[PDB]
Design a binder for this molecule. Structure first.
Ligand code: ZN
Ligand code: ZN
Lengths: 150, 150
């Protein structure tokens, strides 16, 4: 049983209500979304950064347990050409839950961005047995957001 | 105007309701208290660790602006002889808001401890002009807890 902890602070939303069919339709995979309230995206699991979008609004990670997660800030955020994001961690770096990955400017983003919702998804679903999504308000690197059986 | 940000997650309580007169009577100084909800104490300001109690349940800090804060986990926590606390940072180390200082075990502490309330206080009050305490639920290294004019 794996425990996925919040990469960022805010309220847990339904992947379904994410104004972007790639998320809403679970093309990319399944998980939850977060309506951000903080200033950073942290590592939800222990493992290794995989990729960090140029723009710095999204990143990949693969835990030691074998889970591949994809955190992606906002919708259409690429349009901001990397404006509001400071890349703290490095591609392929070894991380532990809670290690800061990216730092953002909510206020800015809130205004200049299409949407603030941040999808948190498991990219290797075929390797998934059970996925239990939680609910409520969460805090960075502290609160669990999903329970997996794999 | 300085901004003191939450060292830990939880709800902001009244220093006054802290079951320990040293806090409740403002002997040590003034601030707020937090009813913890997370798993770590982070640096509320940018500056330098000053002291770290042997037991690891409390620590001092002095920001670059000239504020001396004292974060102290729970009441009578020394009684636990350092049980439930992992000292992450080091005495006299340079830190930035959000850098983990100590890691704790709430569950444990919640059970074995007298009280969980954590006073957050400014130790050099004489250097203080104005102190504005905020209220509500806060998240680690994100939410502001106090506004100072000094
Ligand atoms: Zn994108
Ligand atoms: Zn003590």
């Amino acid at each position: 049983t794996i425990e996925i902890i919040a990469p960022l602070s805010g309220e847990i939303v339904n992947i379904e209500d994410v104004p972007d069919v790639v998320f809403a339709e679970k093309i990319v995979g399944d998980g939850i979304a977060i309506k951000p309230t903080g200033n950073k995206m942290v590592a939800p699991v222990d493992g290794t950064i995989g990729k960090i979008f140029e723009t710095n609004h999204a990143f990949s990670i693969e835990s030691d347990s074998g889970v591949e997660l994809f955190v992606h800030f906002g919708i259409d955020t690429v349009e901001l050409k990397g404006e509001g994001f400071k890349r703290i961690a490095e591609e392929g770096q070894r991380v532990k839950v809670g290690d800061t990955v990216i730092e953002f400017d909510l206020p800015l983003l809130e205004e200049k961005a299409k949407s603030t919702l941040t999808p948190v998804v498991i990219s290797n679903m075929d390797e998934i047995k059970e996925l239990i999504k939680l609910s409520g308000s969460v805090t960075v690197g502290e609160t669990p957001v999903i329970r997996i059986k794999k």
